[PDB]
Write a protein that binds this ligand. Structure first.
Ligand SMILES: Cc1ccsc1C(=O)O
Length: 119
């Protein structure tokens, strides 16, 4: 029932994601010089360093907000990919599955703690 526990749990999940080779195209903003049409397709860019920095600045109120930004990294990859068989998109699918598998308990524990607090 620790209402604050989600923050360090998310910091540790982010460390695992940064060690995963599949995260490399998503660690920093998409290079607009390499993909000049990126902002014509994507309205809101997102990357793992921005998620980490937002978390570290104390600018997420809940793990649900962090989840929404991580999921935006994956929907952007799905929207920008020219093919569902592309290399970078194939990396985002695996990383999405890894993230969803690990974030489920963080969300569940946080929601459980809030419910206990409301009692
Ligand atoms: C950044 C990028 C470039 C080609 S596919 C892709 C993606 O995010 O799926």
């Amino acid at each position: 029932y620790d209402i604050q526990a989600w923050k360090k749990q998310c910091e540790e999940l982010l460390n695992l994601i940064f060690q995963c080779e599949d995260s490399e195209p998503f660690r920093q903003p998409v290079d607009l010089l390499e993909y000049p049409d990126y902002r014509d397709i994507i309205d809101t860019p997102m990357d793992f360093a921005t998620v980490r920095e937002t978390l570290e600045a104390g600018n997420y109120e809940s793990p649900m907000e962090l989840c929404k930004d991580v999921r935006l990294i994956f929907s952007n990859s799905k929207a920008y990919t020219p093919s569902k068989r592309s290399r970078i998109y194939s990396m985002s699918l695996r990383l999405s599955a890894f993230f969803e598998e690990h974030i489920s308990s963080v969300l569940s524990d946080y929601k459980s703690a809030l419910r206990f607090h409301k009692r």
